[PDB]
Design a protein around this ligand. Structure first.
Ligand code: NA
Length: 267
C-alpha cells in the first residue's frame, strides 16, 4: 500500500533537501500535508499577499498613483524597477513587477506604501494576522528577508499558513472580486515559475503562482491550480537545503517533482 508522505520523504533524501507541502482539503478531496507546520522562509512568496494587502487597503484608483524613486532605492534583483528610475512606476505597475518579475525594489516600495518607510514589514505581518495567520512574520525587507539563518523565525511562514492565506485571497472572500481578479491575473501571467509547480501539472491544468528563492537552498512556489474541468486547488511547496550552507543551490526540480506527486493524487 502506497503512501504519499513516504514519496515526499524519498524526494527529500534524493535532493538532500527539506520539503514542505500543503494542499487544503476541499469538499471533494483530502488535504495533502508534509512538514506543513514547519517554518520555511517566505522569500519572494510574500509578494503575492503583499499585493493583496495593498489592494485591500486602497481604492482601485490607487493603482494609478505614481511612485518615484532613485537608483539608491534599487535592490537586486529588480528587472523592471531599475529600468524606470527616471519615469517612476505606478502602484499597479509595482504590483505587476513584484509578482511577475519578483522585483525586489517594487516589493520594498509596496511595503513602504503599505506601512511607510519604517512600518511596511510590520504592516504586512498585520495583514496576515487579519487573515487568521498567527505564525507568519515578515521582519526584513528585500533582500535581507532571504538571508536569515536556518532556525531563525524571522521572515518565515509555514506551508499550511501560506496555503490558507492564498486560499482566502484567490478562492475565498479576503478581497472583493474586482481586486481578487487583479491579484489572480498578475499571478496567472507570472514569468518566474515555469519550472516549479507548473512543471508538475499537465498542460490542461491552469496554474497561477508566485515563486520564492533564497539562501540555504530555499526554493518555494505557491500556486492556485484549476483542473481541466475547472476545479481549483491551492498548492504550497516550500523547500530548503540548509545542510549545504548559505550558498546551497536552490532546486526548482524538487518543487516540480513534489507538484507531480500532488497532481498524481489530484488528477
Ligand atoms: Na527617480
Amino acid at each position: 500500500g502506497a503512501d504519499l508522505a513516504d514519496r515526499f520523504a524519498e524526494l527529500e533524501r534524493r535532493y538532500d533537501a527539506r520539503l514542505g507541502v500543503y494542499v487544503p482539503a476541499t469538499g471533494t478531496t483530502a488535504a495533502i500535508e508534509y512538514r506543513a507546520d514547519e517554518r520555511f522562509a517566505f522569500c519572494s512568496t510574500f509578494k503575492a499577499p503583499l499585493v493583496a494587502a495593498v489592494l485591500h487597503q486602497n481604492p482601485l484608483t490607487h493603482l494609478d498613483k505614481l511612485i518615484t524613486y532613485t537608483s539608491d532605492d534599487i535592490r537586486s534583483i529588480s528587472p523592471v524597477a531599475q529600468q524606470h528610475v527616471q519615469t517612476g512606476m505606478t502602484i499597479g505597475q509595482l504590483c505587476d513587477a513584484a509578482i511577475r518579475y519578483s522585483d525586489n525594489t517594487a516589493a520594498n516600495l509596496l511595503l513602504a506604501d503599505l506601512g511607510g518607510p519604517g512600518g511596511g514589514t510590520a504592516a504586512f505581518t498585520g495583514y496576515l494576522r487579519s487573515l487568521g495567520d498567527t505564525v507568519s512574520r515578515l521582519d526584513a525587507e528585500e533582500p535581507e528577508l532571504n538571508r536569515d539563518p536556518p532556525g531563525d523565525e524571522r521572515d518565515t511562514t509555514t506551508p499550511h499558513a501560506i496555503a490558507l492565506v492564498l486560499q482566502q485571497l484567490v478562492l475565498g472572500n479576503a478581497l472583493p472580486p474586482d481586486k481578487r481578479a487583479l491579484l489572480t491575473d498578475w499571478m496567472a501571467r507570472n514569468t518566474t515559475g515555469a519550472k516549479r509547480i507548473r512543471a508538475g501539472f499537465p498542460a490542461d491544468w491552469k496554474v497561477i503562482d508566485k515563486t520564492g528563492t533564497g539562501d540555504y537552498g530555499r526554493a518555494n512556489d505557491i500556486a492556485v491550480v484549476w483542473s481541466p474541468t475547472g476545479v481549483p486547488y491551492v498548492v504550497a511547496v516550500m523547500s530548503d537545503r540548509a545542510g549545504g550552507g548559505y550558498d546551497a543551490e536552490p532546486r526548482e526540480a524538487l518543487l516540480a517533482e513534489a507538484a507531480t506527486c500532488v497532481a498524481g493524487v489530484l488528477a
